[PDB]
Amino acid sequence: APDREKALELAMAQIDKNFGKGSVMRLGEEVRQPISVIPTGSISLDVALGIGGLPRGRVIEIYGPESSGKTTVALHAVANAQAAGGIAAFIDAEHALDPEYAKKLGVDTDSLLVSQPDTGEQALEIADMLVRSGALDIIVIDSVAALVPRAEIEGEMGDSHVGLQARLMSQALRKMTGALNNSGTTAIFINNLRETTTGGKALKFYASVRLDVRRIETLKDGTDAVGNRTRVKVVKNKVSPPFKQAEFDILYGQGISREGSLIDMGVEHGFIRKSGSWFTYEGEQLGQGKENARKFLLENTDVANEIEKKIKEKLGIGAV
Numbered sequence: 001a002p003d004r005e006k007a008l009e010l011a012m013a014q015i016d017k018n019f020g021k022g023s024v025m026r027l028g029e030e031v032r033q034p035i036s037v038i039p040t041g042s043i044s045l046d047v048a049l050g051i052g053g054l055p056r057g058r059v060i061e062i063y064g065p066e067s068s069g070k071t072t073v074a075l076h077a078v079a080n081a082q083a084a085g086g087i088a089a090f091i092d093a094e095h096a097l098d099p100e101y102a103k104k105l106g107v108d109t110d111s112l113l114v115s116q117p118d119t120g121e122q123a124l125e126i127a128d129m130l131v132r133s134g135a136l137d138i139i140v141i142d143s144v145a146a147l148v149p150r151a152e153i154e155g156e157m158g159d160s161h162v163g164l165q166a167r168l169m170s171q172a173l174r175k176m177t178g179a180l181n182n183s184g185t186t187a188i189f190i191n192n193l194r195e196t197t198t199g200g201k202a203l204k205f206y207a208s209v210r211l212d213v214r215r216i217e218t219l220k221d222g223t224d225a226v227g228n229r230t231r232v233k234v235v236k237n238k239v240s241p242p243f244k245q246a247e248f249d250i251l252y253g254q255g256i257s258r259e260g261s262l263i264d265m266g267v268e269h270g271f272i273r274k275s276g277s278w279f280t281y282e283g284e285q286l287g288q289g290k291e292n293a294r295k296f297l298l299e300n301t302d303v304a305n306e307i308e309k310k311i312k313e314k315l316g317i318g319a320v
């Protein structure tokens, strides 16, 4: 009477219908569910998410040490969203955002809504009011940790002191999620690891995607300062097989390196052969060293476009 796979599929189907698609899935699976996404500005990361970017209408948590590249990504995500004609909001509670650099990542600052809350309550509340106006494509919150409760902001008392910030973050997400789904706005919470910074206790559970951003390199070329290589681990993904990983370069002053990406993905996917210490494409000399090659590609814009083309086809081409 027993046939495992037939009895497993039936189980899984039931699992998914009781708790929503993505509740459980084979790791080696491949999802042709396109959803809707905001390209992360990182091709590797985009592929890593399995859907080409951050799904829309969901809670995304981007946690990681300072300087690791979290807000850069978040900023790119905002820029992409805006070019698709979407409206963006930035609930700033850190007062660290540098609009100039943001413009450089392609963000249209002037049309970017910014709000600098007085309390954690107000901040989440402002975000919630915006998000249920349905006019927003993406809303990023700086600093999960800067969401400190009012009672705490206003010299409270060492008594009746509580785990108040986490609860604040839970009640807030409880109602902001539904709204987020109806509206379709993607909400990116930036969580600096310095619970997951107190409020990330719930974030962990409410997020459909959670990125673990980490700094792994110092982008040196050969011997001087240009930027840093980042590594993102998709620790949680309710819309595609999780645990994938992506790497990419962020230069000082310049957002995620396109050419850099192309060179990397290009190589691992064959299209660009890498005789040790010399990069070459379709018989053309690219240069010695990731930078010379990066340069080559940035300059000969024609090449690196047929590459971007070739890599794009082999992975995620237009669907359904």
Ligand SMILES: Nc1ncnc2c1ncn2[C@@H]1O[C@H](COP(=O)(O)OP(=O)(O)OP(O)(O)=S)[C@@H](O)[C@H]1O
Binding pocket: 064, 065, 066, 067, 068, 069, 070, 071, 072, 073, 096, 098, 101, 192, 227, 228, 250, 251, 252, 253, 254
């Ligand atoms: N204002 C800026 N001007 C020029 N480059 C910047 C600026 N801010 C960040 N960068 C670049 O972005 C890289 C790191 O990205 P971040 O914005 O720090 O992402 P991240 O670490 O989540 O952000 P933090 O530190 O939480 S704010 C830095 O190493 C620089 O290369």
Ligand SMILES: [Mg+2]
Binding pocket: 118
């Ligand atoms: Mg004030």
